[PDB]
């Protein structure tokens, strides 16, 4: 739900 | 000084909800430890994000609008350098950069 979670799923 | 106020307005629209669907990957610094990008610091020597740029505008670190725009373009170059060309985050970076370049060029002189 966080920016880091979205960021993680976007890059990897 | 008046152009530095425009730089704050440009970054404010870059943060606005109208662009959030493609601007959000650049909101905050790339946390290399939390995101598992164990090669980022070897490739990117000068990281930059919209939140750091905002703090440097608030601290009046940028002398002119050209130095502000250099940090904005550094943020995009880091994304183009680290990620593959066909990556989805590269397309999102071109979108946000097109928004920046237009407003940065249309800045009152
Ligand atoms: N991913």
Numbering used by the authors:
A (entry chain B): 1 to 12
B (entry chain A): 351 to 459
Show me the paper's own sentences about this structure:
Within this class of proteins, the bromodomain and extraterminal domain (BET) family contains four members that are transcriptional coregulators and that recognize acetyllysines (AcKs) using a tandem pair of highly homologous bromodomains (BDs). Despite heavy academic and industry investment in this area, the generation of paralog-selective inhibitors has proved elusive because of the extremely high sequence similarity between the bromodomains of family members (90 to 95% within the acetyllysine-binding pocket residues). Using the highly conserved BET BDs as a model system, we conducted three mRNA display-based RaPID (random nonstandard peptides integrated discovery) screens using a single library (which contains >1012 unique members). Crystal structures of 13 distinct peptide–bromodomain complexes revealed highly diverse structures and binding modes among the cyclic peptide ligands.
Likewise, the most abundant family identified in the BRD3-BD2 selection (BRD3-BD2 family 3, accounting for 53% of total sequencing reads recovered for the top 500 peptides, including 3.2C) was not found in the BRD3-BD1 screen. On the other hand, the family to which 3.2B belongs was identified in the BRD3-BD1 screen with a relatively high abundance (BRD3-BD2 family 2, accounting for 8% of total sequencing reads recovered for the top 500 peptides from the BRD3-BD2 selection and 19% from the BRD3-BD1 selection; SI Appendix, Figs. S9B and S10). Cyclic peptide 3.2B showed strong binding but relatively little specificity, consistent with the abundance of related peptides found in the BRD3-BD1 selection; interactions with each of the six BDs had affinities in the range of ∼10 to 30 nM. Strikingly, 3.2B forms a single, well-defined α-helix in both structures; this helix contacts the AcK-binding surface of the two BDs with a very similar overall geometry and places its single AcK (AcK7) into the canonical binding pocket. It is notable that the AcK side chain enters the pocket at a similar diagonal angle to that observed for AcK5 in the peptide 3.1B binding to the “second” copy of BRD4-BD1. Because of this insertion angle, the hydrogen bond made by 3.2B with the pocket Asn is again mediated by a water molecule. Most of these hydrophobic contacts are conserved between the BRD2-BD1 and BRD4-BD2 structures, consistent with the similar affinities observed for the two interactions. Furthermore, peptides that belong to the same family but were derived from different selections (3.2B and 4.2A) adopted near-identical structures and binding modes.
